[PDB]
C-alpha cells in the first residue's frame, strides 16, 4: 500500500502543478490512477496528484516533484520518500 521512491527534480513544465511523476510499476503497487492523490512523506507529509513518468525515468524507482514539495518535506534530491494512496 506504500512504496519508497527516490526524489528527483520536476521538469520545468511541471513546476507548480502539485504533481508527482511515477512509473506504472509504482502506480500498480499503490493501486492509483493518474490524477489520484497520494501522500508523500519523510517526516512531514504532502498530498500530490499522480502523473505518468517520462520514458527516460521508467524503471529508475524515482518520483519527480518540484521544489515547493521538497521544501515542505525537508527532502533533498536522491533521498527516499514514502508514497501512499490517499
Amino acid at each position: 500500500l506504500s512504496v519508497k521512491l527516490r526524489v528527483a527534480e520536476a521538469y520545468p513544465e511541471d513546476v507548480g502543478k502539485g504533481i508527482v511523476r511515477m512509473d506504472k510499476a509504482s502506480r500498480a503497487k499503490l493501486g492509483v490512477s493518474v490524477g489520484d492523490y497520494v501522500e508523500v512523506k519523510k517526516v512531514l507529509s504532502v498530498k500530490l496528484r499522480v502523473a505518468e513518468a517520462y520514458p527516460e525515468d521508467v524503471g529508475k524507482g524515482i518520483v519527480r516533484m518540484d521544489k515547493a514539495s521538497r521544501a515542505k518535506l525537508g527532502v533533498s534530491v536522491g533521498d527516499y520518500v514514502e508514497v501512499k494512496k490517499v
Side-chain angles (χ1 to χ4, degrees):
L1 181 123
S2 84
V3 185
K4 304 150 184 188
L5 296 169
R6 292 176 304 126
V7 172
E9 301 106 310
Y11 296 106
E13 51 266 39
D14 297 327
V15 171
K17 304 192 201 173
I19 67 168
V20 277
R21 292 201 179 272
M22 75 184 76
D23 64 28
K24 171 68 164 180
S26 294
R27 301 196 302 276
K29 290 200 273 262
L30 291 173
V32 294
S33 297
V34 173
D36 289 352
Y37 276 106
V38 290
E39 184 189 347
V40 186
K41 185 173 186 174
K42 194 72 131 153
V43 174
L44 301 212
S45 300
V46 299
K47 280 172 280 176
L48 296 164
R49 299 179 295 130
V50 176
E52 281 146 319
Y54 274 18
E56 61 266 29
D57 300 324
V58 169
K60 304 212 291 213
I62 69 172
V63 54
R64 291 204 176 263
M65 80 185 81
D66 64 30
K67 184 57 190 300
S69 318
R70 304 202 296 279
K72 298 178 186 185
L73 294 175
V75 301
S76 306
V77 177
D79 284 351
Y80 281 100
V81 290
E82 290 193 346
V83 185
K84 186 180 65 165
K85 181 165 178 62
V86 176

